[PDB]
């Protein structure tokens, strides 16, 4: 009898073979091709053999014509699906003649340390490109480090020019590098919605990940309206600090852009806060936005015009100014102004009487 160890391995089932209630599949502890008869087979779900659900075969001969005819045995562990997805290690420690024959196994054999990375960019935003009239785009690239000939090549509809970017950073703490790839383009091409791919070239894998990105043909046009609101009376009764609010409604599409103004100079960006658009409740998606702005109240009780502006595609000149300051009361009522109106008239006739009898006692008194 030739004392021979078996070819100890574990073969895994396919991922989509779990069926039943609950969905189950099985395993194979291949310890085949062994002589002599003595062998011990034990699974391990993370350092523990599970008792039930095990179908261990017997020491059975293989089809061999010459040489030492060995034997085969195969344990079969019925397993569950969520357990198999749960990254548990499964070791079938075979002990053929008391010899530790393990096979650490699971189903997680992905790992990909490679070069082909995600390559995209932001579109030219309507807020930014209004300020400089300088529609450009910046290719966002991570999951790549500093190799040679790291190229940012913005091909056009059929492969045209690109300004080579400058002002590179250092590498990220997770070893990637910001290939900060910018290029200025024409002014109406994105307004006509052209196809702009950040084709890249790199040393290890030069694969250009293309981006057929253009202007999203779609949403229609509506002029927003701008309704500046004056502060609250209890709030100034606290006489601490007030809150003017500029409010827009109903514009289409999104990405509107506001900033305060007074005397022509801008305010500090840390002063005033805005919000992103929200969907409108009643109508379809004609959004709205708001902006709050603190002051000193001792600043506010003097004057100081305080205007608001706005920036939408729908607006023909892209700028509208509104302002209300401290005294824009707006028609409280008519019988109140008639009330103290009439009392003002009665006081007027009173003092005209006292002057009248000043005169009629003056002429008689000055004899």
């Amino acid at each position: 009898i030739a004392e021979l160890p078996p070819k100890v391995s574990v073969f895994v089932p396919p991922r989509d073979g779990f069926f039943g209630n609950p969905r189950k599949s099985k395993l194979i502890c291949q310890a085949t091709g062994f002589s002599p008869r003595q062998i011990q087979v034990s699974w391990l779900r993370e350092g523990k053999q599970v008792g039930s659900g095990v179908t261990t075969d017997q020491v059975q001969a293989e089809a061999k014509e010459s040489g030492p005819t060995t034997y085969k045995v195969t344990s079969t562990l019925t397993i569950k699906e969520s357990d198999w997805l749960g990254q548990s290690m499964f070791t079938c420690r075979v002990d053929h003649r008391g010899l530790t024959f393990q096979q650490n196994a699971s189903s997680m054999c992905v790992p990909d340390q490679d070069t082909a990375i995600r390559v995209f960019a932001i579109p030219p935003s309507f807020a930014s490109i209004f300020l400089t009239k300088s529609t450009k785009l910046t290719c966002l690239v991570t999951d790549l480090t500093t190799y040679d000939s790291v190229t940012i090549s913005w091909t056009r509809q059929n492969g045209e020019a690109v300004k080579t970017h400058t002002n590179i950073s250092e590498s990220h703490p997770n070893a990637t590098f910001s290939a900060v790839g910018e290029a200025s383009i024409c002014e109406d091409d994105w307004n006509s919605g052209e196809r702009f791919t950040c084709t890249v070239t790199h040393t290890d894998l030069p694969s250009p990940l293309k981006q057929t990105i253009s202007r999203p043909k779609g949403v229609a046009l509506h002029r927003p309206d701008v309704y500046l609101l004056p502060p609250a009376r209890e709030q100034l009764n606290l006489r601490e600090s007030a809150t003017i609010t500029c409010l827009v409604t109903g514009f289409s599409p999104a990405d509107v852009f506001v900033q305060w103004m007074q005397r022509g100079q801008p305010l500090s960006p840390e002063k005033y806060v805005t919000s992103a658009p929200m969907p409108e409740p009643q109508a379809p998606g004609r959004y709205f936005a708001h902006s709050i702005l603190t002051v000193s109240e001792e600043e506010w009780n003097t004057g100081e015009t305080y205007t608001c502006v706005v920036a939408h595609e729908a607006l023909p000149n892209r700028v509208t100014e509104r302002t209300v300051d401290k005294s824009t009361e707006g028609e409280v009522s008519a019988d109140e102004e008639g009330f103290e109106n009439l009392w003002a008239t009665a006081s007027t006739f009173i003092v005209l009487f006292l002057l009248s009898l000043f005169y009629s006692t003056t002429v008689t008194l000055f004899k």
Partner: protein
Amino acid sequence: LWMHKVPASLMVSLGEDAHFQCPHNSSNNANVTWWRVLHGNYTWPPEFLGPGEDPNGTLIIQNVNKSHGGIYVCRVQEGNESYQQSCGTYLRVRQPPPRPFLDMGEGTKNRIITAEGIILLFCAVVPGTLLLFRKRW
């Protein structure tokens, strides 16, 4: 029955000390609680204002500030019987009094101004007649 006897509203100025009476119907051996509610068909639960004070079952609030609005309701129950909920007296914290011009009403002031105009004119006519029309004779 008695479930409307408490008056509808009450006038209390700032800093004052309040009074609330709940004229029950049962025989004096009950439990007396006070609760503070909202508008109506309320969805947020109320909270326990306080127990009774005296055998009159009065409720007294001291140091009224401008944050003491809200509908107050007496709840009183004796044993395992039914519990009584009133309709409740609304409150408004109304301090600022005018420095009172008590020695007239202004509806009475300016009619005195008009009649004083009549009396002052009719008093004002005749000595100017009597002097120069008794002078030349």
